[PDB]
Design a protein around this ligand. Structure first.
Ligand SMILES: *[C@H](O)[C@H](C[C@@H]1CCNC1=O)NC(=O)[C@H](CC(C)C)NC(=O)OC[C@H]1CCC(=O)N1CC1CCCCC1
Lengths: 300, 300
């Protein structure tokens, strides 16, 4: 059982380079529009309190250099939607996949295609943290990298990368340019709210460890949902809802371990620790596999 | 702060096809006008328990092989066997063939796996070749012929093709010349992996990573010979170092100014003395699936 990203080819064919001034980041080219973070228009000065409408009205199409590979794309118009800039170009991307823009919920996972200068460099799986950060790997120049899920032939874009926080986690927007979380695209050190652990995902993973013949942490006991949640919140774990219990059904049927029985195992682990032992390779409880993720990878 | 990060998979996605013999379907790799796949596609279940591949192959003709990209049949105009891979000459050169080569990697090296079923990619993830020549993959029925690769500049270096799952649930396969990694054979018989050891060169890369990040409590004032370190390491189930290992730690040694053999002395002390309750990069466990290349690629 492995942390698996979606194949990235459909997204790679959409990545381009966007330059304004001495700022270069990545853009997402879909049909005849390139989406990118609007802070590409900010100067060293601007970035502390950028009045974006005011800065954007002063820009001309020819101030934006867009390159796909060796070719430059002519910008013929631009608009702003929240924190994303939309550069209209004179050419349609023939590699545009079937796609939609979605806003994901905390606890949900997605694949990130990390890009630099419009060129893809790596792909990995991340989750929207309960505090709306993402624990990514992003360096200078990664802005405009996107996160996505694939269903059949449809790419659902859910994330565009904008910034790193002082703690080393990351923040960004959906493809409508609305941030996840209380963050703002100005050059300031911003802290997130307190993070918590995605409890339904930890349970999915424990079930995964059992499908793979790992069951040392199981115990003969059970718990009510509310008593489990009391203990969870004590340990800064998210509460488990009845929908979460329902979502865990398939994994429960598969292994014949009731959801609330696994909650009793997880309660024991929180109270007792792992005592040196490890689970599916990990010394820590893992919370960035969803129920769907576990199944998709025990399915094909 | 480190993630397993795969290479973008699009260039390899554009090479994946399916190969069927009778009812047995696995994946093939289409490069120029050749399709490469595991030779056991020619085996019925009865042949698998104990196959005569040379005789099974003589009985076959080009018209027994169904090669498809999607649902589009690719006509086979020739066939041959190289070690445990079948090479199917086809009448169409793959228009999406990237620049590529076939390399045989050493234990400890990491690579990206594009897991595929019926010629369609399902996921990409990073694997390390263990010293016992197995990988901890996530592979189901129908995954054979999925490949492992690295990308350098625009060149895809193919290093792995998947063939089997061992009793303990780890995975084995060949290079793209059909030579198995390790002592395994493509027969449905009882086979076991050697006892595995820790990848010393990668632990050292991880210690260099910790130093780059300012986490350097474990550095000591002493040094060692390569021979004395190797003899100590084997007593802790660590792999001895090779000269090539010393060389691929070169860039990280230069980046930090810590000679390789001084780092070895620091690792020797950790082995002999333990962590004493402390952590490195946030963990009490030493990581051994990040190569020196992985470290630089995520730090720089
Ligand atoms: C876009 O490519 C870029 C990606 C960042 C760079 C390093 N890692 C990333 O993910 N994004 C930015 O540069 C944003 C631009 C703003 C106008 C939104 N800023 C940003 O990420 O910042 C850098 C981080 C580093 C940690 C931190 O504190 N900080 C904020 C500022 C102010 C406080 C002092 C440090 C610099």
């Amino acid at each position: 059982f492995r942390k698996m990203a979606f194949p990235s080819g459909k997204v790679e064919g959409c990545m381009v380079q966007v330059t304004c001034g001495t700022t270069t980041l990545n853009g997402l080219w879909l049909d005849d529009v390139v989406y990118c973070p609007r802070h590409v228009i900010c100067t060293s000065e601007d970035m502390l309190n950028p009045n974006y409408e005011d800065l954007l009205i002063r820009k001309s199409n020819h101030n934006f250099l867009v390159q796909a590979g060796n070719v430059q794309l002519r910008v013929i118009g631009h608009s702003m939607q929240n924190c994303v800039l939309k550069l209209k170009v004179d050419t349609a991307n023939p590699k545009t996949p079937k796609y939609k823009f979605v806003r994901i919920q905390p606890g949900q996972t997605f694949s990130v295609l990390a890009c630099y200068n419009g060129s893809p460099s790596g792909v990995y799986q991340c989750a929207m943290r309960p505090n709306f950060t993402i624990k990514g790997s992003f360096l200078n120049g990664s802005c405009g990298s996107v996160g996505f899920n694939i269903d059949y032939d449809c790419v659902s874009f859910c994330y565009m990368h904008h910034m790193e926080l002082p703690t080393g986690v990351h923040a960004g927007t959906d493809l409508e340019g609305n941030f996840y979380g209380p963050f703002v695209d100005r050059q300031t050190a911003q802290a997130a709210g307190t993070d918590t652990t995605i409890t339904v995902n930890v349970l999915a993973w424990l079930y995964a460890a059992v499908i793979n013949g790992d069951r040392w942490f199981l115990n003969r006991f059970t718990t009510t949902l509310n008593d489990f949640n009391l203990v969870a919140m004590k340990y800064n774990y998210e509460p488990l809802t009845q929908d979460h219990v329902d979502i865990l059904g398939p994994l429960s049927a598969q292994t014949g371990i009731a959801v609330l029985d696994m909650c009793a195992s997880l309660k024991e682990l929180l109270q007792n620790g792992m005592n040196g032992r490890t689970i599916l390779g990990s010394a820590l409880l893992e919370d960035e596999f969803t129920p769907f993720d576990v199944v998709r990878q025990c399915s094909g």
